[PDB]
Amino acid sequence: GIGTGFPFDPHYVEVLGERMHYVDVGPRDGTPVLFLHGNPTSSYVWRNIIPHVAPTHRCIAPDLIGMGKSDKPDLGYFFDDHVRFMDAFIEALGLEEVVLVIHDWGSALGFHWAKRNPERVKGIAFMEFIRPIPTWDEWPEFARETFQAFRTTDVGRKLIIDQNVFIEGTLPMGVVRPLTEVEMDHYREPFLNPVDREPLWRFPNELPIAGEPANIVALVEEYMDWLHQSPVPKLLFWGTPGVLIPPAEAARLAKSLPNCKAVDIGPGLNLLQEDNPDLIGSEIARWLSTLEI
Ligand SMILES: [Cl-]
């Protein structure tokens, strides 16, 4: 049974006038491993991966501003807002060198930070990550109509904010196995107050699809170009059929990105951590040792 509990003491740090919650376990010395979640999750999504890494490495898993147990100010929650809070979170923890383990919008944060701080990144493990989607054809057919509807103001906000469809519908449809009721309640908990669902709606409207929004496309293109030229060790997890990363794209990146190891997790959609956490956690732990310190 994939574990449903969240046995991590809460930690908080002041970041630009707000508090961010984070997991912090494992030994204090050595290179820390920074786990970055995306939409509509929290550090909860890493709960069954962290235990594989924490014996040998510090594990830091923040909740993005507006999400999880972090503070939820009255922001637009643009990607830019997440960048500012995460930059300040990393500095507030005094993090020097890090290994990144990143997913969905957390991977946009992680790659963008790595591009700007390349000397401080000792490895990146990533999965179902944000890349430019050049045409709506390159978005999975089964979720095309709904994400197109999410990317409207009136219909999209009614779906995501008023009716909480990204939590109640999109999130379970991002996992091959059924999420249990205990798991759904952990994911529901940050968003019981409808006004707090703003990040859940802004995030899909930030996705770089068919050239829009132009500012996000540009940013993502820039860090994908950095990633293609960087020698940083890379570990890419992928599933079948995937959502953001179909198997063919994973196979292409395994050869185009330098020093990149790709791992097939089996059946998977977006939240690969919920379908095969033991493989993801085991492989991260073993790969960390191959980085050799
Ligand atoms: Cl999204």
Side-chain angles (χ1 to χ4, degrees), residues 1-137 139-292:
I2 290 162
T4 67
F6 192 77
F8 303 104
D9 295 334
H11 302 267
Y12 298 90
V13 64
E14 294 145 90
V15 179
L16 308 172
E18 307 294 329
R19 296 219 292 184
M20 282 172 67
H21 166 256
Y22 60 108
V23 173
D24 186 359
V25 296
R28 307 291 92 188
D29 64 333
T31 302
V33 184
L34 179 61
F35 296 77
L36 303 181
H37 76 82
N39 191 36
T41 64
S42 74
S43 53
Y44 189 73
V45 79
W46 302 117
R47 72 200 178 280
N48 296 316
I49 295 179
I50 287 170
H52 290 270
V53 178
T56 56
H57 289 77
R58 187 177 179 193
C59 293
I60 304 174
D63 295 336
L64 302 181
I65 190 74
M67 310 179 76
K69 301 174 193 184
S70 294
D71 284 358
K72 309 190 167 53
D74 188 5
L75 313 182
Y77 293 100
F78 291 93
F79 181 71
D80 290 352
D81 302 333
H82 287 291
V83 169
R84 292 213 61 212
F85 279 92
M86 189 56 66
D87 279 2
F89 172 85
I90 289 160
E91 294 312 304
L93 263 55
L95 302 193
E96 303 210 20
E97 250 172 52
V98 304
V99 173
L100 297 169
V101 175
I102 59 191
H103 176 231
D104 186 81
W105 279 105
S107 76
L109 289 171
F111 285 138
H112 184 60
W113 190 87
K115 183 194 79 175
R116 301 175 286 137
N117 300 278
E119 299 93 356
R120 290 159 75 182
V121 177
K122 293 330 293 198
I124 314 179
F126 50 104
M127 67 208 70
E128 276 286 312
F129 64 91
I130 307 291
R131 79 186 161 108
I133 303 303
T135 59
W136 271 107
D137 294 28
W139 192 264
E141 187 282 332
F142 87 101
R144 197 176 281 131
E145 175 171 331
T146 295
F147 271 78
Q148 282 167 345
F150 285 167
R151 284 161 69 92
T152 70
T153 301
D154 291 341
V155 172
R157 289 179 75 80
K158 178 181 180 186
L159 289 171
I160 294 181
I161 296 182
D162 296 347
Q163 295 159 336
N164 209 18
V165 171
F166 215 101
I167 288 283
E168 300 285 350
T170 313
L171 159 70
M173 294 182 63
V175 189
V176 171
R177 68 145 177 116
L179 289 172
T180 74
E181 191 64 21
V182 167
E183 295 168 327
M184 291 294 298
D185 282 347
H186 275 279
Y187 280 125
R188 282 159 181 156
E189 199 175 23
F191 302 114
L192 302 175
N193 191 347
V195 75
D196 292 328
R197 295 163 194 167
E198 193 71 34
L200 313 185
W201 173 85
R202 180 54 69 171
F203 264 143
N205 281 271
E206 292 282 69
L207 287 165
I209 307 166
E212 307 179 342
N215 65 302
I216 299 302
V217 170
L219 183 149
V220 172
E221 277 170 354
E222 288 163 17
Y223 70 56
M224 286 314 295
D225 192 47
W226 171 86
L227 191 72
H228 270 96
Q229 63 88 57
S230 172
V232 68
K234 297 177 204 60
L235 179 59
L236 167 59
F237 295 92
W238 60 275
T240 295
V243 172
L244 300 172
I245 309 297
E249 176 68 12
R252 194 186 70 76
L253 297 161
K255 290 164 65 67
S256 66
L257 302 175
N259 295 322
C260 181
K261 171 178 172 72
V263 174
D264 180 6
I265 62 129
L269 287 157
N270 181 254
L271 284 75
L272 305 188
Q273 312 97 311
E274 294 291 10
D275 276 305
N276 202 350
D278 283 333
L279 177 63
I280 296 170
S282 171
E283 293 271 358
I284 293 172
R286 288 185 272 145
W287 166 79
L288 286 170
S289 182
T290 73
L291 311 181
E292 277 165 74

